[PDB]
Amino acid sequence: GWVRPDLGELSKVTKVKTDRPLPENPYHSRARPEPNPEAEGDLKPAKHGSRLFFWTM
Amino acid sequence: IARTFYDGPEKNYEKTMAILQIEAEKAELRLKELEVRRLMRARGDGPWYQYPTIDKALIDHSPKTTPDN
């Protein structure tokens, strides 16, 4: 009672039901380094301007 | 002459005080700014001197014809 698979059937992506637990860290990755914290707050004008040599603005 | 062409000593005195305060604050700001630049360039933990790396969104996380990546 064996039916030969039709053209296009053996190349299907199928689903598999397994009792094997899904691996957590398959790449064996280290802990990722913490990022630089953030930019936060409101933008205030520069204190006493550019503060270049003699420029008051 | 004093009444017509000049002001009292208080005006110049307190204008000098304001000018001195502004100048001293600018000096301390300049020194602090140099120190902050040095620390940020040495450690790289600040918003400045942030040199580009590779964007992680370019990585393709799909099966690769071979199980071992």
Ligand SMILES: CCCCCCCCCCCCCCCCC[C@@H](O)O[C@H](CO[C@H](O)CCCCCCCCCCCCCCC)COP(=O)(O)OCC[N+](C)(C)C
């Ligand atoms: C009784 C006989 C003896 C009296 C002798 C008196 C000696 C004085 C005469 C000499 C003149 C003084 C030289 C002018 C320098 C002053 C410049 C400046 O300091 O004055 C400004 C004021 O401006 C003045 O108007 C100066 C004007 C002087 C212009 C001189 C021109 C004279 C030339 C003569 C021409 C005559 C006709 C020509 C025919 C061809 C000050 O600005 P301001 O910030 O506000 O004042 C702050 C003080 N407050 C707040 C109290 C007001």
